[PDB]
Design a protein around this ligand. Structure first.
Ligand code: 8SU
Ligand code: MG
Length: 224
């Protein structure tokens, strides 16, 4: 019932099994509407799985529904990228998605554009730090459990955030490495802007219009 245990449990229960991965579409050197649609499908498919991870963070389910939505929606792309980066094999150009589908980076270029290159690069940096499951489960939680403008119960979010911070602190001790760990969180904000830049392009291009939920989330989150 420990907090770090519950966070690890949240992480483990919402990630695909390495023992049952889907290589049926994988192409190391591959030879467009359906690539863009794939990109959207990967985003939408990831949404329900991350929300399900969010709900397994202690205290998260206890917030007003408005606050849950605010936290989730604000951190979604940050979460998508982090979990992808941690799961994948950047040395081999392999991206492993939340449904267990394995695709080469080259297969992701048409849909994601320049963004998978940023993702794969980030995955390289993240993995070179050799962050254990416990520590990652903390960083993942902190990407979402953070103060946002428009929270009905910010002190509750603040309280939960610091509890996760101290979990990570205690686990690290089992000081230097902690700052570089928390330093991955502003780097995700940049990666999120980049996903947004990609959706922006695609929508402007208007070859495939984004599905309703992506569209709604994209439009609402723009501060202009
Ligand atoms: C990640 C980087 C961004 O550019 C946006 C930030 C936008 C507004 C600030 C929110 C913080 C607050 O509420 O105070 C975020 C991304 C948010 C996305 O996850 C929203 C979904 C995009 C549609 C797929
Ligand atoms: Mg507008």
């Amino acid at each position: 019932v420990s907090l770090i245990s519950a966070l690890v449990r949240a992480h483990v229960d919402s990630n695909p099994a390495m023992t049952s991965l889907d290589y049926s579409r994988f192409q190391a050197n591959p030879d467009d509407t359906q690539h863009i649609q794939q990109f959207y499908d990967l985003l939408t498919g990831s949404m329900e799985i991350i929300r399900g991870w969010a709900e397994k963070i202690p205290g998260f389910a206890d917030l007003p529904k408005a606050d849950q939505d605010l936290l989730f929606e604000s951190a979604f792309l940050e979460l998508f990228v982090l979990r992808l980066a941690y799961r994948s094999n950047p040395v081999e150009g392999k991206l492993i998605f939340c449904n267990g589908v394995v695709l080469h980076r080259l297969q992701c270029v048409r849909g994601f554009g320049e963004w998978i290159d940023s993702i794969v690069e980030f995955s390289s940096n993240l993995q070179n730090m050799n962050i254990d499951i416990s520590a990652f489960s903390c960083i993942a939680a902190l990407a979402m459990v953070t103060e946002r403008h428009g929270l009905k119960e910010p002190k509750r979010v603040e309280e939960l955030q610091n509890k996760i911070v101290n979990c990570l602190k205690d686990h690290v001790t089992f000081p230097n490495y902690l700052s570089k760990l928390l330093g991955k969180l502003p780097e995700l904000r940049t990666l999120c802007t980049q996903g947004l830049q990609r959706i922006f392009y695609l929508k402007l291009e208007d070859l495939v219009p984004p599905p309703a939920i992506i569209d709604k989330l994209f439009l609402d989150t723009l501060p202009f």
